[PDB]
Amino acid sequence: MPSYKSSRVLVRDVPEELVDHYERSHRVAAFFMRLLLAMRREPYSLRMRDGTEREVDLDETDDFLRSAGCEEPDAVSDDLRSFALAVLHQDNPKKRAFLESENCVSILCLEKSASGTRYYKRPGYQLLKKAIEEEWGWDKFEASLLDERTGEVAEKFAALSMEDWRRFFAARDPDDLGRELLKTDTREGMAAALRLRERGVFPVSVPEHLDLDSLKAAMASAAERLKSWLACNQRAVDEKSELRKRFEEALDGVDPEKYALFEKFAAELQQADYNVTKKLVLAVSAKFPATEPSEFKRGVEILKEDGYKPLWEDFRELGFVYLAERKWERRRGGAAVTLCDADDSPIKVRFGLTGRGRKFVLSAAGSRFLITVKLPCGDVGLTAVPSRYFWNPSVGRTTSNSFRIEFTKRTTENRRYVGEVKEIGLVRQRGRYYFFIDYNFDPEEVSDETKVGRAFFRAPLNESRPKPKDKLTVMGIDLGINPAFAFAVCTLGECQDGIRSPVAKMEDVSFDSTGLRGGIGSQKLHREMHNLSDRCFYGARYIRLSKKLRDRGALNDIEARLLEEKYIPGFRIVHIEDADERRRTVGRTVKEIKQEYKRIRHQFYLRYHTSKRDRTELISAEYFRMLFLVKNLRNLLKSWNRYHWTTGDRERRGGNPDELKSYVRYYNNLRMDTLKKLTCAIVRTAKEHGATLVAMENIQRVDRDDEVKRRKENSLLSLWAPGMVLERVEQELKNEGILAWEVDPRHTSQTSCITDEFGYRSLVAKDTFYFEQDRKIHRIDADVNAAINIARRFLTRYRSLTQLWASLLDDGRYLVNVTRQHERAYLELQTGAPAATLNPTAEASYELVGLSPEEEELAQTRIKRKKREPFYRHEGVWLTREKHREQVHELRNQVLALGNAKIPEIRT
RNA sequence: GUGCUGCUGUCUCCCAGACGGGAGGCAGAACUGCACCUUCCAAGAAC
DNA sequence: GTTCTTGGAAGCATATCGT
DNA sequence: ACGATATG
């Protein structure tokens, strides 16, 4: 719930006393992870050190329960299951037995304990009893418990019988009803545990002994890991049940006898050494009496008509059902249990100030942290190697059982930070010892005016919400690849000069400051990153074709043309007809590609290590191009290592577990660095301008009508999942006190921000956008225009809609489908009714007319005629896709005829 | 401290199979640059 | 060639009896 | 006051 940040410090050597504690803690943690799973009478799977999944059947779990101390782990199965469910938090969140999963150690791993007998905190009972006993009227208590409540806690404390509870209170400050409540409000888990102790199963035998705090830390880590495993396993079971449902759905749609005949066909085809796959099913479904390509003749041309004529017309759906069944039969039935290991899957050996783990004293001196750990054996003083994250630390103890640290995070700026440390954690990574300083952090307050403004601006026009009522500063973002970031900021109360934009129910605002960020830092390096990436992309295809050339002599016609038209030119090579020589030429080409990759990578490293340092930028397009080059080189190398797959199209999965490990590592690390630097740039631009509210492009959805952001080689979606990017930028803008919203990008890249009409984005000068103003042709930067459009959409609350879907009623009219509340708001404001239809006009356009609610059913009577259709807005009329592009093409032919010289430029 | 992140020399293990590729270790030289919540986890996709 | 929108586990509070 | 369980 709180805010968190962390970094690791390096402890050079740790005495043998702390080493032994680390290993014994890991041992006990593994023991608990094993014991909780065992307590469940449910088989599971383990990921062993070498990757092979064992299946621990009930035998090994029963033997483990026996070794742990249980004399007969057969009849006590149900109580153990209840306890396991309780400790892993699979119980009622209100009646939860163990709010923290480490509260169970004392009842389990100790001889003398009082769990389940103490009652001083169970409900508010004791506190309320003493409070009323502190000279407060019982009528007030009864009222506040019965009728003054609407959702308060007092309602949920009252598990007792009121007609008898209000008879107990006659006695002064009693505890008899307290014991009654203790034995009445039994939580199932703790009752099961008490039954187990009385039975004689508990105080189980632990591994190498430790004090209670170490046991609590081990239990916490084990419980965390097992709860993650349970969540993953539940999702796995859900997906497999969904697959079974899909199999049932597919099977219900065919004749079972025909499905059995198709099963016979598939079995015989497999006996013919052909495994059933979507590709061959589709190939066979093309034309049964015809001849399939050479890739399928061996398996098809000997079985296609051998008694399987009856299912020729149904082969398609029958193959679909067979594929569904064979997918369900092979998808994982569960998720394997990764298990704790001091060197293979370390846990955090944790130290806390309130019982969880053993205490520690965090100290600083001479620019380095001095950690002190109160191990049972004694006291251990460690010196941490200086860190530039926590530079020049200072630390003092607060009166809240916490340490307050003030430090400098080294950057261009050297801002001081302040956070609180309450838990510290050990870990052994690549042999060395580290401490995870997880520390708390309080961001900026975020003013109430900002929240009012956000609620106002994100709402549709048909929802009344209070006005911003303040001089907010809103800024837009347009995320991209080449220009990673473009912005435009307005002050919401001033229109001194610049591009103007309406604001909902306020004066007009001006985008005084607009800019471009990112872009090409160096031209040559970007061009070479682009070329070398293209070679790898096409090289893998050349390898794929060469392999099946060597296997089957000649390609099919179309795939052969692709080799000459696309692959050979784009993967510089002289195509040798000989099969043997193709290996050696391909290897030589891969050698050249690796040398070029090394050169480019070195130049990219000289960013910060040449006198040109000062002219580099926090983020440049090279980051994004370098990610694509790495991604494509991974594919090319993976194809080359797989060249000798003689079978040509048969699977040999498994093999090397590392392979291109260095390239995957580099890809992930460079992605992380790029995302971090990008978000730093956005946040710093926002702060420099005071943008307390930030409108953002919603990359989750792609505008199909755009030509730049739609393709694979230019999309951010190809490097990250869209959710991972905006969430990171959203979070730290918040941490700096800036609230941000996501706006739909539909037609923002191809609609004017001065005018409201469509235009042209150049296919050659990709960074320019053309439109018409005063019937003169002007141009602007295609990315600042997108930012202004996003901000304008945020500010006007989506007043102007550029696209509308419709369906063709047979009358010759189109009915508008409304599903987003912005559509309803627009259709209401422009016409006056919730729904409307587009009526043709003689000038080859359709006009909105609006409908009364009654005729909606009449329109629905015919709406089923056709599919959804797109319609686009121009100069106050609406026109169709085939004619929308015509108007854009007219502007295209006009611009190429006019030239850049006669075109004025808008400022940016 | 973790990355961005490399170079020279040099040793070792794998897949080729005589064209090449892929895990790692060790010793040097060049630069004092830019960022930094981590941990635990199994656009690609349909026809 | 023509279109569409991965989630989970964690990173401590305070109360009370006895010296 | 502070320490050792105990459990929101």
How far is residue A652 CA from its own chain's centroid? Answer: 31
Closest protein CA to C1' of nucleotide C3, residue: A704
| DSSP assignments along A818-869, one per residue | --SHHHHHHHHHHHSSS--EEEEETTTEEEE----TTHHHHHHHHHTTS--E
Beta pairing partners, A758: A751
Structural tokens at position A402: 């916490």
Å between CA of A435 and C1' of C12: 19
E-strand stretches of A430-517: 432-440, 474-479, 485-490, 499-501, 509-511, 513-517
* Domain range summary for chain A, segments of one domain joined by +: 17-234, 448-520+676-792, 523-675, 801-898
Scanning the structure block, which residue is given the tokens 């989750």?
Answer: A700
Q: Helices (DSSP H) in A329-359: which residue ranges?
A: none
- Domain spanning A448-520+676-792: CATH superfamily: YqgF/RNase H-like domain (3.30.420.140)
Asked if residue A314 lies in contact with residue A323, where contact means CB atoms within 8 angstroms, the answer is no
* Covered bases, chain B (protein CB within 7 Å): 1-7, 14-24, 30-31, 33-44, 47
Residue A228, nucleotide of least CA–C1' distance: C9
Name the nucleotide with the smallest C1'–CA separation from A117. D6
What technique was this entry resolved by? cryo-EM
Residues having Cβ less than 7 A from any atom in strand D: A 99-100, 103, 106, 110, 113-118, 121-122, 212, 354-355
Residues A885, A871: Cα–Cα separation, whole Å: 11
Centre a 10 Å sphere on the Cβ of residue A15 and count the other Cβ atoms it contains: 14
CA atom of A118 to C1′ atom of C17, Å: 12
Measure A570 CA to B3 C1' (Å): 34
Inter-residue contact A873 to A804 (CB < 8 Å) = yes
How far is A633 from A627, CA to CA, in rounded Å?
10
This PDB structure is determined at a resolution in Å of 3.1
Q: Are strands A768-773 and A776-781 parallel, antiparallel or unpaired?
A: antiparallel
Residue A544 one-letter amino acid: R
C1' nearest to CA of A212: which nucleotide? D5
- Minimum CA–C1' distance nucleotide for A285: B47
Instruction: Tell me the residue length of chain A.
Output: 908
If we measure between CA atoms, which residue out of A34, A22, A424 comes closest to residue A229? A34
Which of A423, A403, A410, A397 shows the shortest CA–CA distance to A367?
A410
Q: What is the CA radius of gyration of chain A?
A: 35
Q: How far is the CA of A612 from the C1' of B39 (A)?
A: 38
Rounded, the Å distance between the CA of A597 and C1' of C11 is: 41
User: What's the CA–C1' distance between A386 and B7, in Å?
Assistant: 27
Instruction: List the structure tokens of A229.
Output: 């495993």
Distance A628 CA to B15 C1' (A): 26
Are residues A274 and A299 in contact, defined by beta-carbon separation less than 8 angstroms?
A: yes
What is the Cα–Cα distance from A300 to A297, expressed in whole angstroms? 5
CA of A594 to C1' of B10 (A): 21
Burial class (CB in 10 A: 0-12, 13-18, 19+), A23: middle
Long-range contacts (CB closer than 8 Å, 24 or more residues apart) made by A664-671 = A664/A634, A666/A630, A667/A627, A667/A630, A667/A631, A667/A634, A670/A623, A670/A626, A670/A627, A670/A630, A671/A627, A671/A719, A671/A720
Nucleotide nearest to A717 (CA to C1'): B43
Cβ-based neighbours of A626, under 8 Å, separated by 6 or more: A529, A600, A601, A604, A670
Taking a C-beta distance cutoff of 8 angstroms, is the pair A324, A246 a contact? yes
Strand partners, A467: none
Nearest-nucleotide field for A720 (CA, C1'): B43
Q: Which residue is nearest to nucleotide D4 (CA to C1')?
A: A355
Residue A844 has a CB neighbour count (10 Å cut-off) of: 11
**Closest-approach nucleotide to residue A88, Cα vs C1':** C9
Instruction: Give the orientation angle of helix A77-87 with respect to helix A188-199, to 10 degrees.
Output: 130
A234, closest nucleotide (Cα–C1'): C8
Structure tokens at A643: 């060249």
Residues packed against strand C, CB within 7 Å: A 2, 4-6, 89, 100-103, 120-121, 126-127, 130, 223-224, 227-228, 231-232, 352-356, 400-402, 422-423, 438, 440, 700-702, 704, 721-724
Q: Return the H-helix or E-strand segment holding A568.
A: helix A568-570
Distance A582 CA to B18 C1' (A): 14
CA of A387 to C1' of B1 (A): 5
The amino acid at residue A871 is F
Mark the nucleotides of strand C covered by protein, meaning any atom under 7 Å from a CB: 3-16
